[PDB]
Each structure stands twice: as structure tokens, then as C-alpha cells.
């Protein structure tokens, strides 16, 4: 039952699809936090590496962002397909892609690749964040190799996910979500220290990658 996608285990779940998730758990950690009007994405990062030609957070559009965990090679291709769809939708239609639409398409591609025994499903779980065009409601979504996409207030995928998804669960209150850029950033940083690069996306296609996070690290570390 383990060696095929088209075979159900006697207990009723496809093992091969599950095995793709453990590949994600082996990947680098990714984090995402939804503020009242902003979304923050944090990621887990040798001596001779060329750091000037490397960002684990790749933007699919001016207003949409996509982090990932798992096999980097698969992600680089899944990102490309999403980028083409974003422009194709912007071409066939006039409005930009809805955040829910992009994750639905990306999940469909992952789901599509599960529909044959001659194809390896993408061992990557995406963490899509952004704002709907002309909207101020932050939206964060997560996709899995199985093709299931979900909307999360805060999620972490990859290496050390359960430990980080437990820290967020107790420190993040759905009824008391952070209401400032600093507050969510501090939570994301504090989330990553339990084991730095931080990206902040704000409405109206205002995406900025933070620099000098040491201030938050120094502030959080003291507390």
C-alpha cells in the first residue's frame, strides 16, 4: 500500500501522499502571522555562499506572496506556474488574482500531480499570504502536497513545526490578534527563537523585507 498513489491503505488513507508530508517536515522552517491589517512571514536560513544572489519568500504578484517548505527544487517550479496564472488571470480577466484563487490554483497543481502513478507529487507545502485587490483584510493560506488548502490565522511548516505551532497556539489569540506591525513581527520573531529573515506584506501591494531585525531580537531576548 506504501508504494503507490492509487492504492488506499486498509485503514483508509493513502500512504504515498502522507510520505510527501514528511518531506515537507524535513524542509526549512517557515512561519506566517496574520495581523489586523498586515501579514508577516518568517523563514529559517555556508561560509562561502554568495548571499547576494540568493529570499525564501518569493512574491507571486505585486500584492501576493508565497513562502514554502520542503524540496526547494519543486517549490521553484510550483512558484513559476503560480506566477504565470497570476498574469494570465490579469490578462483574461481585468482584476488581479484573489489570494483564495491563487492558493486554489496552486493546490490544484499539487492535487493534479497526484492523479497518476508516473508522477512524483510536489514535496512542498506553500504558505501563501497577501491581500485581495482593493481590500484591507489580511489573508494567509497553506497548501499541502495532497492538494488540501486551508486558511490560517498563523501557521508554521517544516523543520520544528509542532514545537513552533504550539508556541503560536498559546501566544496567539483569535479574539486578541496583534493589531500592530511590531506586535505581529515580535510574535513571528519570538516564534522563530523557540528553535532571522522577516517579510511584511501590507495592503495595496506594499511588500517590504525587513532589515535590522536585531532590535526585535534584542528586545524579545531581554524579556
Amino acid at each position: 500500500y506504501d508504494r503507490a498513489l492509487s492504492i488506499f491503505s486498509p485503514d483508509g488513507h493513502i500512504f504515498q501522499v502522507e510520505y510527501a508530508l514528511e518531506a515537507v517536515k524535513r524542509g526549512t522552517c517557515a512561519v506566517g502571522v496574520k495581523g489586523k491589517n498586515c501579514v508577516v512571514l518568517g523563514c529559517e536560513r555556508l561560509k562561502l555562499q554568495d548571499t547576494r544572489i540568493t529570499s525564501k519568500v518569493s512574491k507571486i504578484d505585486s500584492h501576493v506572496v508565497l513562502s514554502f517548505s520542503g524540496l526547494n527544487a519543486d517549490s521553484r517550479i510550483l512558484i513559476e506556474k503560480a506566477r504565470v496564472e497570476a498574469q494570465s488571470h490579469r490578462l483574461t480577466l481585468e482584476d488581479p488574482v484573489t489570494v483564495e484563487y491563487l492558493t486554489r490554483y496552486v493546490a490544484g497543481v499539487q492535487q493534479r500531480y497526484t492523479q497518476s502513478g508516473g508522477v512524483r507529487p510536489f514535496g512542498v507545502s506553500t504558505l501563501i499570504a497577501g491581500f485581495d485587490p482593493r481590500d484591507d483584510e489580511p489573508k494567509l493560506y497553506q497548501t499541502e502536497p495532497s492538494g488540501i488548502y486551508s486558511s490560517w490565522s498563523a501557521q508554521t511548516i517544516g523543520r520544528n513545526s509542532k514545537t513552533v505551532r504550539e508556541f503560536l497556539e498559546k501566544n496567539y489569540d483569535r479574539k486578541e490578534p496583534p493589531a500592530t506591525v511590531e506586535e505581529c513581527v515580535k510574535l513571528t520573531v519570538r516564534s522563530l527563537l523557540e528553535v532571522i529573515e522577516i517579510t511584511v506584506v501590507k495592503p495595496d501591494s506594499d511588500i517590504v523585507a525587513l532589515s535590522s531585525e536585531e532590535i526585535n531580537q534584542y528586545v524579545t531576548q531581554i524579556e
Partner: protein, 237 residues
């Protein structure tokens, strides 16, 4: 489908896909062995008869009619670690066991020892209800009468229980055994609607329930939704 894959050749059938107790396949030492903790506070003499079953036959013992109630559970553990516990039930003067047999999560070794403990602590009128993939039709059996033809046999937990009633310590206990034909791995056996009718209306003879009322209760529990019926309610016309 123009061709069959060259690489798709089954692994030899002599080996079963049983759960792996320990990842160390290269272990060259005596493996640890399970323990079974039968609760000592059970007043067995109060019960004149005892029923040993696996979970797939639960619908034959309705909570709604029999007034089933718990008395406790057996505990089993294994270090390498694994821990499983199995409730004990009774109704009237009858002591009942259901092991929650599983092919993937539970290895047969656990069932073997539970068979040891159950028989080592019950050695009442033993009733064994089971299933087998190697029997063409339903079989009624006892210690002094065998109905199986040479080709057929019984495996799994019910084989474990029957083994102790026949051979090993405490052999010779009087027992009445009922096995219905089924298919599938341990813990997922499926029974045909014909078997279910033949099954309730026969075990009712020994257990002594009002056959029509007992059948009416059982069919609802059999057919509405159960692991034994599966897709057979809608997969067939």
C-alpha cells in the same frame, strides 16, 4: 492499457505484511515479549459462560437489548514502545471480550499473549466467534467435533484462542465455536448480507434471545453502518 509495467512484480507471497515490532531488523538478541494484565477483581464464577470475539462481530451484541456494561479492560505493553488496552464487557451471566483486532497497528503477537491470558484465567462455557478467509461457508464447531475440510483452516486471533483450547497449557476446555466466511486483512474483514442473516439467527440459538426481536435489533446495527457491511449495501444491486 497497452502494456503491463515490467517493474510491477509482486514481492513473494511467503511473507506477510505484518507490522514491524522493532526498526532494528538486524537485531541478534532475544526480542522483548508482550505482557498481559488481566484484572483480578473480575468475579468470573458469577458468569456461567464466556464469549470471546473480535470487534468485527460487535453488532451481534446490541447495547440496546442486552443491557451491556463494562467491568474493566485488559492492559498490554511492549518495550523496544507499544501499549494497548481492551475493554471487558458482560450481560447477564455471560462474560464477553472484544480485542479490536487490527492488521496495521496491532501485530499478531499481542493477540497471542491475550489468548494466553484469557485462557489461563478462564480455565465457564466458552463461546468463540470468529471469521476466516479460508472457509467456504459458516462452520459450527466444538472440542469434540470438527467440520473444517483439510484445505480450510482458521488464522489470526481466533486461531490463537482455539489453539489454547486445543493444545498448550489448560487444554481440553469445552467450547462452542462459530466462524463465518470473510475476506480482507485482520481487523477489516467483510461479511456478506447472507452471512449476517445466517449468523444472528444461529448465535441466538445458543445465547437464547428472542430470535425475531434479536434479529430485528441486529440487522439495524449490521446494515445501517458497520465495518462488516462496508460498501456491500450500495456496491451491489
Amino acid at each position: 492499457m497497452l502494456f503491463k509495467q515490467w517493474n510491477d512484480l509482486p514481492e513473494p507471497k511467503h511473507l506477510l505484511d505484518l507490522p514491524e515490532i522493532s526498526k532494528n531488523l538486524q537485531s541478534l538478541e532475544v526480542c522483548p515479549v508482550p505482557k498481559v494484565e488481566f484484572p483480578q477483581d473480575l468475579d468470573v464464577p458469577q458468569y456461567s459462560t464466556a464469549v470471546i470475539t473480535t470487534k468485527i462481530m460487535n453488532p451481534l451484541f446490541p447495547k440496546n437489548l442486552l443491557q451491556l456494561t463494562s467491568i474493566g479492560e485488559i492492559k498490554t505493553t511492549l518495550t523496544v514502545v507499544y501499549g494497548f488496552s481492551f475493554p471487558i464487557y458482560s450481560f447477564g451471566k455471560t462474560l464477553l471480550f472484544s480485542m479490536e483486532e487490527n492488521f496495521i497497528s496491532i501485530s499478531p503477537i499481542f493477540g497471542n499473549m491475550i489468548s494466553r491470558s484469557i485462557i489461563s484465567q478462564l480455565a465457564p462455557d466458552i463461546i468463540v466467534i470468529g471469521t476466516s478467509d479460508k472457509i467456504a461457508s459458516m462452520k459450527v464447531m466444538t472440542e469434540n467435533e470438527c467440520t473444517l475440510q483439510p484445505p480450510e483452516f482458521i488464522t489470526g486471533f481466533i486461531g490463537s484462542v482455539l489453539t489454547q483450547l486445543i493444545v498448550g497449557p489448560s487444554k481440553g476446555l469445552k467450547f462452542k465455536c462459530l466462524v463465518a466466511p470473510s475476506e480482507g486483512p485482520n481487523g477489516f474483514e467483510k461479511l456478506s448480507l447472507s452471512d449476517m442473516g445466517s449468523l444472528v439467527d444461529l448465535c441466538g440459538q445458543w445465547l437464547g434471545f428472542e430470535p425475531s426481536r434479536y434479529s430485528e435489533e441486529c440487522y439495524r446495527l449490521w446494515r445501517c453502518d458497520s465495518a462488516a457491511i462496508g460498501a456491500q449495501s450500495g456496491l451491489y444491486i
